[PDB]
Amino acid sequence: SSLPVPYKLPVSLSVGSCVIIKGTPIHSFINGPQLQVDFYTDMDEDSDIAFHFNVRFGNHVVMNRREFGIWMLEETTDYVPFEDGKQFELCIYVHYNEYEIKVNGIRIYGFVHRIPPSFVKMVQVSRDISLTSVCVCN
Amino acid sequence: SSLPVPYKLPVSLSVGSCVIIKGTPIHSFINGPQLQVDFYTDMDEDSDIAFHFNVRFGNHVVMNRREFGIWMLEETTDYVPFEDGKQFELCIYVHYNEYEIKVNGIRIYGFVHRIPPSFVKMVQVSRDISLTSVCVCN
Ligand SMILES: OC[C@H]1O[C@@H](O[C@H]2[C@H](O)[C@@H](O)[C@H](O)O[C@@H]2CO)[C@H](O)[C@@H](O)[C@H]1O
Ligand SMILES: OC[C@H]1O[C@@H](O[C@H]2[C@H](O)[C@@H](O)[C@H](O)O[C@@H]2CO)[C@H](O)[C@@H](O)[C@H]1O
C-alpha cells in the first residue's frame, strides 16, 4: 500500500468537492473483504459521522450516520460493481443535497445530507484494502 | 471560471501531498498577467506564508516566505514554461525537504521548507487566471 490503512485524512469539504479513493482489496471476494469510508466531524474517531459507507465486496453496501453518538437509520444497496482482485476507483461527490457515490464510474447511490457537508473535517478509509491514492478535488 | 478567484482552500498538507492547479490566464502575455499561489498558515490573509509563488507570465517567477509578518529573502527563476492563451497545469509536490514546482509537467524549482509543510492550513490561488480545478492528492 502507498498509504497506511486506516488512513485518516484531514479534509475541508464544500458543495462541489469530490473525494476520489483508489485501492485494491487485499483478499479475494470468497474471503469476505470489506472497505469502509467514514466522513468524520473531527479527528477523534468517537465524533459524529455525517456519512458512513461500508461495502461487503460481492455482497452489499451499508450506509448510515452517527448523530449525538447514536447510529441512525441504516440504508443499504445490493449494487456493488467492484471486480474481484482488481483496483477500484471510489468517487464521492458532494452535491448540495447529497453525497453521490460512484464505483468505477458507476453511480450506485445518493446519500442525503442530514448535517451540512462543511461539518466534515476528516475522512477515514479503512478495512481490507491497499490504498493507491486519495484525492480531494474542487 | 469554475471556481471563484481569489480561491481560498482550507488544506492539510503532509509529505507526499500534491497540489494540482489547472487554469488559464485571463489576459494575453503582452498584457502582463500574473498567477499567485500562497501556502498560508491560517485562513487570515495576514498570517505567515510558508511558500509564496508569483509568476509574471512570459517574464519570471518570484518566490518567498513570510515569517513573523516579515518577507524573507526572495528567490527567483526565469524558467516559466507557460503557453500564451492556453490552460496550464501547476503541480506543487510536498517533499520532506522542499516543495517541488512543476509547470505543465516540467520541474522548474524546489523551494526548501523553512517551516514544516504541516503548518500550512490554507492555499490561496489568486490574480489573473480562470480556475478549472484544484486538487489535493496523497
Ligand atoms: O449502520 C452501520 C453501523 O451499524 C453497526 O452495526 C449494526 C448492524 O449493521 C445491524 O445489522 C445490527 O442490528 O446493529 C449493529 C449495531 O451494532 C456497526 O457496528 C457500525 O460499525 C456501523 O456499520
Ligand atoms: O518577495 C515577494 C513579496 O515581495 C513584495 O514585493 C517586493 C518586491 O518583490 C521587491 O522587488 C521590492 O524591492 O520590495 C517589495 C516589498 O514590498 C510583495 O509586495 C509581496 O506581494 C510578495 O510578492
Put simply, whether A1 touches B (Cβ < 8 Å) is no
Whole-angstrom Cα distance, residue B85 to residue A130? Answer: 41
Count other C-beta atoms under 10 Å from residue B79's C-beta: 13
Burial of B14 (0-12, 13-18, 19+ CB in 10 A): middle
Nearest to A82 by CA among A51, A135, A127: A127
Q: Which three cell numbers, joined as nine digits, stand for B106?
A: 516540467
Burial of A40 (0-12, 13-18, 19+ CB in 10 A): buried
Residues having CB within 6 Å of any atom of ligand 1: A 52, 54, 62, 64, 71, 74
Pick from B20, B2, B10: which is nearest to B138 by CA? B20
Report the separation in Å between the CA atom of A95 and the middle of ligand 1, taken as the mean of its atom positions: 26
Measured between CA atoms, how close is B135 to chain A, in angstroms? 4
Nearest residue in chain B measured CA to CA from A137? B135
Enter the DSSP assignment of A82.
P
Q: Are residues B1 and B11 in contact, defined by beta-carbon separation less than 8 angstroms?
A: no
Question: Which residue's C-alpha cell is 479503512?
Answer: A126
Strand, coil or helix: B118:
helix
Q: Reported resolution in A?
A: 1.6
**Pick from A97, A123, A93, A96: which is nearest to A105 by CA?**
A93
DSSP conformational letter for B3: B
| Amino acid identity for residue A43 in this structure | M
Give residue A85's region: left, alpha or beta (phi > 0; psi -120 to 50).
left
* Nearest atom in ligand 2 to B54's CA: 23
Architecture of domain A1-138: Sandwich (2.60)
Asked if A26 reaches chain B (Cβ–Cβ under 8 Å), the answer is: no
Between CA A111 and CA B66 the distance in angstroms is 43
Flag whether residue A9 sits within 8 Å of chain B, measured between CB atoms.
yes
Please say whether the beta carbons of A59 and A77 come within 8 A: no
- Sign (positive or negative) of CA dihedral A52, A14, A21, A46: negative
Structure-derived torsion over alpha carbons of residues B105, B89, B21, A93, reported in degrees to the nearest 10: -100
Going from the Cα of B72 to the center of ligand 2, the distance in angstroms, rounded, reads 10
Boundaries of every domain in chain A: 1-138
Spacing, Cα A87 to ligand 1 middle (Å): 27
B67: part of which helix (H) or strand (E)?
strand B60-67
Q: Give which of B31, B12, B8, B16 is closest to B93, Cα–Cα.
A: B16
Q: For ligand 1, atom 13, which residue shows the shortest CA distance?
A: A74
Nearest CA of chain A to the CA of B1: how many Å? 12
Task: Name residue B112's beta-bridge partners.
Answer: B98
